[PDB]
Design a protein around this ligand. Structure first.
Ligand SMILES: CNC(=S)Nc1ccc(Br)cc1Cl
Length: 330
């Protein structure tokens, strides 16, 4: 089997991407944030504290003839941005772009963090990291991909995120028309439950390539590119007027400035992030100071290849017995 679904930016800055997901019988379609940095499929629901719902589409398990309470099961999660949610669990039928999984764990939110409430465009998350990170207790649950894997033509999914435009998530096949050149594959460690790999280095604009190992995670659920302070300093030093602002919480720059590209290494291959991708607009409405899309990972404990990096490539999440990651230009 295969599946193919379009993923769409939630706003003009590509802060996140939403993908339609059919849940239950008859289908209830929710727009979920596909997140390769986490492993819970959780949704706003009829059970969510009413004051914490503000515009989102909810899942109502009582209206689904295939929904079954996973008795005794609870879930609770906290994300890297300080957001969180918790609730109970149903199994139900979940379809993405024509690919159907029966008995998928659907985690119903009873409580969500204010940041989720405040984003009316995201109805929940669909986690695509390794199932070892799943927070369901007492019985850990499998991700949508884990459940689908044996049925897929090939045990892979691909992320093809657009710049200020829709893109595509495919399951079970590699669309050879979606990228240029070849796909370079690179080793993955699953020890932290992430799609964790090691970049071979970086260049800033037309600058010479610096060969240096950068360990990080491929994370569709994170907006920006978070890299070591040395690397990030080298980048912003090439932007006139750029400064790290403690009160803003990162590097800012005047948008009258021209951003250089940023290249990262995948084995001997190179992915180029155009400078335009690194512009995230005024820090506040009407401000002449713009927020940068490359920021320091120093306070995080891990480097994150977020949407800023991934949307510059066609990315293969290979769930073979020994998982790997593939990157191609496009
Ligand atoms: C909130 N944390 C991250 S990485 N990203 C982000 C920024 C702004 C909006 Br609106 C939504 C998201 Cl998901």
């Amino acid at each position: 089997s295969t599946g193919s679904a379009t993923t769409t930016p939630i706003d003009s800055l590509d802060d996140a991407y939403i993908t339609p997901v059919q849940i239950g019988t008859p289908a209830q379609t929710l727009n979920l944030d596909f997140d390769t940095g986490s492993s819970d499929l959780w949704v706003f629901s009829s059970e969510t504290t009413a004051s914490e719902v503000d515009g989102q589409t909810i899942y109502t398990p009582s209206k689904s003839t295939t929904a079954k309470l996973l008795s005794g099961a609870t879930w609770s999660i906290s994300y890297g941005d300080g957001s969180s949610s918790s609730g109970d669990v149903y199994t139900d039928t979940v379809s993405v772009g024509g690919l159907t999984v029966t008995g998928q764990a659907v985690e119903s939110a009873k409580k969500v963090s204010s940041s989720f409430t405040e984003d009316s465009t995201i109805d929940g998350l669909l986690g695509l990291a390794f199932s070892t990170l799943n927070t369901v207790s007492p019985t850990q649950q499998k991700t949508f991909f884990d459940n689908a894997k044996a049925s897929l033509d090939s045990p892979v999914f691909t992320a093809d995120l657009g710049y200020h435009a829709p893109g595509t998530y495919n399951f079970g096949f590699i669309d050879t028309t979606a990228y240029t050149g070849s796909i370079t594959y690179t080793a993955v460690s699953t020890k932290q439950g992430f799609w964790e790999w090691t970049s071979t280095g970086y260049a800033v604009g037309s600058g010479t390539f610096k060969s240096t190992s950068i360990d990080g995670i491929a994370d569709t659920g994170t907006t920006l590119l978070y890299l070591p302070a040395t690397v990030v300093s080298a980048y912003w030093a090439q932007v006139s007027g750029a400064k790290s602002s403690s009160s803003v919480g990162g590097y800012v720059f005047p948008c009258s400035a021209t951003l250089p590209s940023f290249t990262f290494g995948v084995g001997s291959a190179r992915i180029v992030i155009p400078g335009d991708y690194i512009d995230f607009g005024p820090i506040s409405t009407g401000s002449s100071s713009c927020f940068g899309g490359i920021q320091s990972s120093a306070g995080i404990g891990i480097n994150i290849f977020g949407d800023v990096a991934l949307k510059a490539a066609f990315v293969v999440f290979n769930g073979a017995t020994t998982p790997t990651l593939g990157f191609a230009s496009k």
